[PDB]
Every structure is written in structure tokens, then in C-alpha cells.
Curated annotation (Swiss-Prot), chain A:
Changing residue 137 to H: Full repressor activity, but no modulation by peroxide. Its main location: cytoplasm. The keyword Repressor applies. The gene is perR. Keywords: Cytoplasm, Disulfide bond, DNA-binding, Manganese, Metal-binding, Oxidation, Repressor, Transcription, Transcription regulation, Zinc. It comes from Bacillus subtilis (strain 168). It is found in: Cytoplasm. Disulfide bonds: none annotated. Pfam families: FUR. Possibly oxidized on a cysteine residue; the Cys-SOH formed in response to oxidative signaling may rapidly react with a Cys-SH to form a disulfide bond, leading to the loss of metal ion and inactivation of repressor function. Oxidized PerR can be further reduced by thiol reductants and repressor activity restored. Zn(2+) binds at residues 94, 97, 134, 137. This is Peroxide operon regulator. Homodimer. GO terms for molecular function: DNA-binding transcription activator activity; DNA-binding transcription factor activity; DNA-binding transcription repressor activity; transcription cis-regulatory region binding; zinc ion binding. Hydrogen and organic peroxide sensor. Represses the expression of a regulon of peroxide-inducible genes such as katA, ahpC, ahpF, the heme biosynthesis operon (hemAXCDBL), fur, perR, zosA and mrgA.
Length: 143, 141
């Protein structure tokens, strides 16, 4: 999975050791249909891993979350589930020259929450494309 | 195609497709500014004798009620006219490939920010929301 590759990329980038246990936890998360609980992951991995406690599952999940790879979804007095995240993108596109500039924007939860309302979709991530005319082509057209 | 599509809009919004209308819409689609009625009058009047600044204005009103132009106001300046490009919002299912359109009332805040940070003059947007549709999500629990 490019997904597993890309998550490991990020771990290594941080100086996070890429241990058998981490590699496994993450691949399980990538392969997951719903977001699993720690207990789900632990039980899927225990056959292959020896030493492995439920504690180390949580400890590694905290490490993925600080690295931005997982979000812990809490349910008051329940077991969290852990969402292996796909990231959102925002691009502005020049209709004249075709240049793309990436920009950051702090989420679009409001939009995601309603689209989920109107469509029925369980939303994972979004790509926003903004069309227009870049500065350098503005000058030439003249604005 | 833009002119084509705007006409399609008029015909359906119930509007006669007079030469002068088609001429102004074509001018609108081909212009990179947001022009004033005098801009548009000066360009076209040479081909239309019965054309007045009024008629330009009156036709812009028509197009604005058809949703094809936005009238931009400022200080004590004469209005400027923006020929609209629709934005689009789609939810795409990662499991079965389905794509569903929905409506959202604009992303003003994002456009104005994008324009600041990238330097772009923004026209419109398309947002794609990836997820899993009702159908596929029931199938998996
Ligand atoms: Zn450009
Ligand atoms: Zn589906």
C-alpha cells in the first residue's frame, strides 16, 4: 500500500524507530474497515507478537497520533476507536498558465458535517480546488 | 462551453435570445475584467444602433435574475459585472466509485484566504469529499 509506505515515511522523518510492532499496528489500521478499538488491534496481532501487551498497543497509538497519523475518537465511558487519517489538500489553479499552488487551510468540518447530512456519506477527507488567475498572469491580462 | 451554457440557462429561465443579449453574454465570457455597462456599450454599440447604456443595464439585470451575472458595487462608482462560473461539490465513494452532487452555500472564507496566501484572483471552486456512501457503509457495518 502506498498508504503504509507514506505512514512509514512520516515516522522515519520524525526519528521514530520503525519496529516490527509499529509496522504491524499501522498495516492493520490501513487494512481496517471501521476504525478499530485498541482491543481489536491487540487481538489481531497477538498470534504474531509475544511480549505484546494491550499497553504497548495504546503506547504506539499515542505515538502515531502525535506524529499525526491516527486520531483517537472518544466515546464517554467507552473504548476509543482509532482513525488512520488520510489528509486533505487545497490547491489553487491558474486557468491561464495552469500553475498549481498548494495552500493550507484549517479543515472544512462544517462542510463535511453537512455533506454527510445531505449525502449519507461517512466522510474521510476532501480536496478543494480553487480556480483563478495567478499574480504573474494577472499582470499580463491586467487584472 | 460557456456561451453555449449561458444561453441554455436563458432559454430555460424563459428569456428571449436577442442578438444584443447574445452579444453582451459573449462579451462577458470573453472579458477578463469585470466590466461596467459603459465598457460593454463602447465595445458593442458599433454593431447595434438601437443600443443604449440603458439597454445594456436592463439586460444585465435579466442575466443577474437568471443567475449568470453578479453585480458588484463600490463607493460612488458605477456597478461592475461578474460573469459567474459555478462551483461544484461532490461526494465520491472510495469503495464503489459512486459520485453524488450536493449544494453548499459558498466558501467565501476559503476563497478570500486562498487569494491572500497564494496571490491568485479567485474565480470559483470545486470540492471533492471522499468517503463511503450509505450503501457501502451498511455493507460493512
Ligand atoms: Zn498563471
Ligand atoms: Zn459506495
Amino acid at each position: 500500500a502506498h498508504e503504509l509506505k507514506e505512514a512509514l515515511e512520516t515516522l522515519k522523518e520524525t526519528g521514530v524507530r520503525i519496529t516490527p510492532q509499529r509496522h504491524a499496528i499501522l498495516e492493520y489500521l490501513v487494512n481496517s474497515m471501521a476504525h478499530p478499538t485498541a482491543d481489536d488491534i491487540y487481538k489481531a496481532l497477538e498470534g504474531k507478537f509475544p511480549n505484546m501487551s494491550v499497553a504497548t498497543v495504546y503506547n504506539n497509538l499515542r505515538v502515531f497520533r502525535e506524529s499525526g497519523l491516527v486520531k483517537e475518537l472518544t466515546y464517554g465511558d467507552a473504548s476509543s476507536r482509532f482513525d488512520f487519517v488520510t489528509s486533505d489538500h487545497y490547491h489553487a489553479i491558474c486557468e491561464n498558465c495552469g500553475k498549481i499552488v498548494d495552500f493550507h487551510y484549517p479543515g472544512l468540518d462544517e462542510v463535511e458535517q453537512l455533506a454527510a447530512h445531505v449525502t449519507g456519506f461517512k466522510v474521510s477527507h476532501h480536496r478543494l480546488e480553487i480556480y483563478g488567475v495567478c499574480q504573474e498572469c494577472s499582470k499580463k491580462e491586467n487584472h
